[PDB]
Structure formats: structure tokens, C-alpha cells
């Protein structure tokens, strides 16, 4: 099995006072890899659950001014393989450590850009928003109609959409719409079901 960065977070950044920085790291690899973020210098510590192709993107939102430089490592994991990149964010030269205040726009911080699988196999595309207040997830489909919980499909507790026993009709561009009072964010997960 393989794993490669398709998008890599920059190795150094400079913060700007009053600004909100979103670090973005994405990868493509076999059998649903999973991206995870951790801050600080760590050698090789381990997490978090040990129980087809997929391209998955995930981002980290720095929404409060830094008091010292920090490193954010984005960790990719599928099966035996494991890959990592780090970004070091310098604080600006000009309240630090205080999350910016009041309503914030949704930003979708975890989605899958492209998903390939074999028919008859159940797939679960994820939408993890980061937004204040807490946003609402509505799922569009391949022909852009709101999802109905038919038991064909189910939108889960976490916003993840579960498409059971995929078939050809199902192939296409699925979209996640996260909305709160101060705006929206949207992301499309392709789906392509290959056959045995």
C-alpha cells in the first residue's frame, strides 16, 4: 500500500496580528488514511485507533495570536505506512493566546476530495466543521438534491454521510454544506465505485 502528500503544509509561516491562519495538509493513499494534528516537538509517540483508494484533506485553524513560536505536525496514517510534515509558525513581531472573539464563519476542516471503492461496499464520507457558533450539516448529492434518510443513505451523528452498498447510480460529486449565522462553507467529495 502507498501514501503520498498531494498538498503539504509550508515548513515555516509568519503570523499576522489580527489574522486567522489555516494550515492545510492533504494526502492520497490506500484504504482510507486518516490525518491527525499535534502541536510541539515529539519524537515518535502513537495514537489513536488500531482496528480501496482515498484522497483526504484536513486543516488546522490558528484563530488566536501566538505568544511564542510553535510547531504543528500533520500525521497521515494508513496500515503499515505513516507520513508526516511540520509547520513552524512564528508569532508576529508586533491579547496573545486569546481566541479571537464572537461569531466565526464555518470552515470545513476535514473532508475527502476523491474516494474510490468496490461496489457493494459501504463508504462513509466525513465533514468535520470548525465554526463558532456550531454549524449545521446538510448533504447534497450527485444530482444536487438534499439527502433523505432512506436507509440507502444516512447522515450520522458527526456529519459523516454513510452511503451503504454503493452502486453505479451513486457515482458522482457529493457536497457538504455547513451553515451558521455568520456564513457557510462547502466541500465536494467525489465518489467512484470500482467493481470486483
Amino acid at each position: 500500500d502507498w501514501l503520498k502528500f498531494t498538498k503539504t503544509p509550508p515548513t515555516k509561516l509568519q503570523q499576522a496580528d489580527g489574522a486567522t491562519i489555516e494550515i492545510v495538509c492533504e494526502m492520497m493513499g490506500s484504504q482510507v488514511p486518516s490525518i491527525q494534528w499535534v502541536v510541539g516537538h515529539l519524537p515518535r509517540s502513537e495514537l489513536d485507533d488500531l482496528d480501496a483508494i482515498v484522497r483526504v484533506r484536513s486543516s488546522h485553524i490558528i484563530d488566536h495570536v501566538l505568544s511564542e513560536a510553535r510547531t504543528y505536525t500533520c500525521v497521515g496514517r494508513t496500515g503499515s505506512k505513516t507520513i508526516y510534515a511540520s509547520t513552524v509558525v512564528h508569532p508576529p513581531r508586533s491579547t496573545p493566546e486569546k481566541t479571537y472573539p464572537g461569531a466565526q464563519k464555518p470552515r470545513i476542516i476535514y473532508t475527502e476530495k476523491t474516494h474510490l471503492d468496490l461496489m457493494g461496499s459501504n463508504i462513509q464520507l466525513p465533514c468535520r466543521v470548525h465554526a463558532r457558533p456550531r454549524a449545521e450539516i446538510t448533504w447534497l448529492n450527485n444530482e444536487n438534491k438534499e439527502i433523505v434518510q432512506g436507509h440507502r443513505h444516512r447522515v450520522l451523528a458527526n456529519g459523516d454521510l454513510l452511503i451503504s452498498e454503493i452502486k453505479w447510480e451513486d457515482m458522482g460529486n457529493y457536497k457538504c454544506i455547513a451553515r451558521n449565522v455568520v456564513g457557510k462553507d462547502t466541500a465536494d467529495t467525489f465518489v467512484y465505485p470500482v467493481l470486483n
Binding site: 492520497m28 484522497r55 476523491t114
Partner: peptide, 14 residues
């Protein structure tokens, strides 16, 4: 429709 995906997929996969 699906046109771009495979090419976009294509570069990465091989």
C-alpha cells in the same frame, strides 16, 4: 461530470 477526477486521480496514483 466525472472527467477531471480520474486525471486528477491519475497523476497521483501512478
Amino acid at each position: 461530470a466525472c472527467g477531471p477526477a480520474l486525471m486528477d486521480m491519475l497523476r497521483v496514483a501512478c
